[PDB]
Subunit: 175 residues, 10 copies
């Protein structure tokens, strides 16, 4: 089980948004004011679509506004990460995205979150981690439809509302 | 992990939408045409909003249309699942619901799906199972904010929309 | 074996008589002056009869008068406990009983007293626990006839008599 | 636990009510028509009142009427069970009794029923066994106050009364 | 092996000669000036003969005169021991004997001396224990003929002679 | 324990009464008609009196009459058992004896009967074996005072006397 | 050790020289006529000179002439092997290469050949496998200085030169 | 794995170049300024050719000039080593070579470097060990063609070059 | 122990007296008519006197006459055994010898006979094996002083002399 | 293996030369100035010949002259040892020999030297033990021909010579 427990930390090398590589990127030292969204994806230079990487790069700003950071990780090295970032989008590239990409080269991180599939690559999953390094929400999927990048943003709202004016519902539930 | 693997099959007392009580409800049977949406909730007679149950009761029909059954499960007993349905919603009751409610009295199911929290109650989580008892998608959180019924539906659509029309990403 | 040994303690949430919930109800901190009667029962919102719960609620006062408290427990949560107490007796409810109802949600207590049946629910059993947390008498049954709620009261008498004018019997036993 | 499970079957020396001495008394045989009432007591020649034995001797007939045999057991040997029956009750004797007395010399029976106290003597406890060697009810305490014979009877009645006429609780 | 080794001690309840019961009778604290004869026997209220108990009771005095005490033990409780002592000899009783009778209720003593037969009763055996708690001689038998009660007495003599004027024999053994 | 159990059977070099040397003397063979009297002694060429051997040599005939063979055993080798018989009794010799002397060179026999003391020599002990290789009586001590031959005989008698005429104890 | 033993056979995705993507490339199949030269390199898209890849691409033909296939392997995925070939060499690309590139995504191959460094990437090492899946020669270092392609060739020659003409050492 | 790790040390007897035997020759105390080349070979007084020993003896000076020492080892005793050195080259001898020959009589060293073949003799392997006792390069072979003696010398150059003016290559690799 | 037990059979390279090199020399084969004399020595090319080898070379014929083959063994390889024979005895060589020299390269033989000292070399020891692969005599020391060849012969004689004419000790 | 290792010590009862028995004879405290010859033999009062005991008794003096003591041991008790010494030689006896005879009654010594045959008796073996309790030479045999008593004496010479003027041999071995 992952949800409710401490989000497993990691110190791996990651390619920042500005493309300069951080050798010892640490999950916990890179949280938003309200936490972060850690997400995985099978592999770089995929043949299908970066559905995941795409959706998320498009919300990075919406998330910042909500106090959350976006951190994506893949079992690919940081070199190949960088490469994908610099490969022209039409040429299959990913384009210079705005979030850190972590290199889980030894597949340890994926294992820790239990998304490591058949000892090779990470599933398409995302985790809502709060300011206390606790995983509150988690959605993992095994299909191309990278909906969770969006969905997560929707949960981040539901969470900040509920966190505020608490939870309300069917006016006739208790009277 | 749960996803990408065969959905752990179970067999337990359940309180069908029509308050009939099945004693040996097997997941591996009551599937939809394309699979099912198995979902959990902490406990019946909660003082917090049933959110999970509500959101799922509404969308039961759609999930159904698109060939997906909806099975709810809790660590509570059918006797109470039952009693919860037959209760004035202002009295905190749940009210007659469409989907079957499975009684995971031995908490074995919550464990197989790994949602058992502190050997006591299950986490608010939902699972998408295809026509081959394959867990293809799982969402799980620990707060009332019911959105599992929602997202699972959207996921059911998205999935199927893709079944045919691909998705030349933007 | 349970009888003769220390009554295993527990700290679980229980719905009091006045219906307000005690989060950390402790068996040992809730004893009568002469001890207590701890009793179990399969499940709430039963379809049959609360024979158990009934019989016992009707003696709660008789027991108080004897210096014993009544404490019933079930593998059901405290919410459902509360529910049953507030469900109209004719509607199947239990009515606002006068004794604490403990929620052995994790089935640990039932296990401790060895009444936990097939890893799911508690048998219909009752335990006479003295002022020293020792279980002196125990009667467990697996039928609807909740006779032991009564029976226990009878033992509590036999005990207080025996405890007083000691044990007497057939005038011609020793001469 | 003992209840809800098959009553551990045994086979040992016993001193039948008619002072005849059976060498291989098997519980699984000497049942009643509806089952039996197996009961233990600390030790023969006790200086405390035999209470258990007394109360059970009286009710032997009724338990019998209602189809229930009554088998007593102690960790003492048949030689002493015997000698205890043939003793002036003012001399602390027990007196010719109706039910058979089993000699649990190896304390194995007391163990199977889990009444062996300190690897020495058995606790004052009684067990209700139905026609299927099923322990359905058990009462066990640690004080002379004999009420096991009593309650077991009342239980035998109650049980049977219900066998037919239910019990629309009050 | 028992002989040559320390006689295993025990603290059990025993019915004395005068019939008052000693709760914590201790083998070592009850030795003669020259040691003691510890003997066992199957069970009380036997149907056959107390051959054992008889023979021994008749020598208790001869043994005392030799500086040895007689202590008999059986897997029967002290109640039944007492009983047998008070049951009229013709009625099968044992009669008010002159030696302590120990109650090896838990069969531990019999086990210690390795005379415990088939986890139930003690064999008919006797041990010559000296002033240093060492078993010098042991005779165990499995038949009704309680000859060892006698025999032991004969050994106690041979021992006190040999202990004195040492061992002598066939005048032509060494010259 | 040894008594009440099958006498551990052995097979080893033995020096028969007639100084003939059997190489594979099996206990289970050389029994008497009613059984045997197996007995041990510390060591040959002892400076202490052979007591055990003496007392047993005398009674060999009677033990024999009553259907009981007499087999002696020591941890010493047949070569020495032999040499001990052929020695001037004033020279500490034992002298031609009637019973066979078994050589328990590997001390395995002394162990099976549990008389091996300090992994070295055997204790002065004797065993009564009935026609069924059953140890029915055992006497064992640790001092010269030979009385085993004696008592075993008296025991052989007593036993047999009872075989017929009971013994209405006094 | 690896040498003198059967070359661990594998089966994984590979990007053939003609950018075709084989899913089940088995070493035990794609051998040469005399064997093969299996070789590893740390990682694709390296910022250090691909040395290994370069030197091997050149000599692919000769190794081929002499009956030796050339299979390269990395812990990277075919998707990236592919993408690495289709990249401007000034952009750090590798450029269309002649030999197949195997994707050791589970690092299992690097392990079997024992070149897996820190459970992460493979060491710059090459292996000579004869027509019998026998590792006959292995060179392995940990620095860019590509000379494996070189020496392996010279070794392929030398070896074969000897196949016939011996070598009366100087 | 051997490369990248610390070169296992050893203290065995070795026949020096000047033929006097060093009883406790220690790998680490016998390194060149830049390291050393440790090489093995099946056995002395071979029937085939000393290809290995030959090639290597011919570069000993070249390696010295590069700051490396040559140290060869074989599972043969140092007596036989000495013998071979003094056996006339045409008589099958090896001739008075200029490098230390180590006697791995117990086959431990060979085992350590994992060149020990079928519990009997060492494979034909060579190891490039740096000034920090780390094995940088390793080439092991199972054929007569002792090419690695040469090859190693070539690597030692590549290394000192690379170590200096670093690594260069295809002018159009990055621009 | 080695003696009184079957001589551990081996099979290894050996350099027969006639410098022919057998690859699979099995002890269990090359026996004499009455058995063999297997013997070890520390190491070839020793700077200490070969004593063992010398003394055994001389007596090879006699040992032979009396039906005893003579097999020498060392932890050195046949290549060196060979080279040692073909060496000027002033050059420390051994010189063409009559008996076969076994190469115990894996030290397994020295171990089976338990003469392996410090997992390195064998102790100067000799073993007498009869026509049934039975070790009947063993001499083993740790100093040059060659006398094994000697004593083994004398033992071979003595033994045989006794084969017939006994030996009424003095 | 025994040779080269420390000679296992022992403290057992031994019948001296003068026939008085030493209760705690200790191998190490009974060495000659140059060591000792420890020898075994199957059993006393043998039916065949004391070949062993004979040969050795005849050299006891020669050995003393060489600085070595002779100590023979047998799995027989010291009583029987004594007996054999006092039984007239023609009567099969051994005669009053001049060396200590040890009683390995528990077969431990035989075991320690690994001459204990089939858990019963000792093989005919002899060990040359030096002044440092190290077994330098060992000859064990399983036949009647007690040649080693002699042989040992021959080795003791070879040893004392070698120990002195060292080892010499074939004048043309090294030149």
């Amino acid at each position: 089980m992952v949800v409710t427990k401490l989000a497993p930390d990691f110190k791996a090398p990651a390619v920042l948004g500005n493309n300069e590589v951080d050798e010892h990127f640490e999950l916990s030292k890179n949280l938003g004011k309200n936490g972060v969204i850690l997400f995985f994806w099978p592999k770089d230079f995929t043949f299908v679509c970066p559905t995941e990487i795409i959706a998320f790069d498009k919300r990075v700003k919406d998330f910042h506004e909500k106090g959350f950071n976006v951190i994506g990780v893949s079992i690919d090295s940081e070199q190949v990460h960088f490469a994908w970032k610099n490969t022209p989008v039409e040429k299959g590239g990913i384009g210079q995205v705005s979030f850190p990409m972590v290199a889980d080269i030894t597949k340890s991180i994926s294992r820790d979150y239990d998304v490591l599939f058949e000892e090779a690559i990470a599933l398409r999953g995302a985790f809502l981690i709060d300011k206390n390094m606790k995983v509150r929400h988690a959605v993992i999927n095994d299909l191309p439809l990278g909906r969770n990048a969006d969905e997560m943003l929707r949960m981040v709202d539901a969470l900040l509302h509920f966190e505020e004016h608490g939870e309300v519902c069917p006016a006739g539930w208790r009277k």
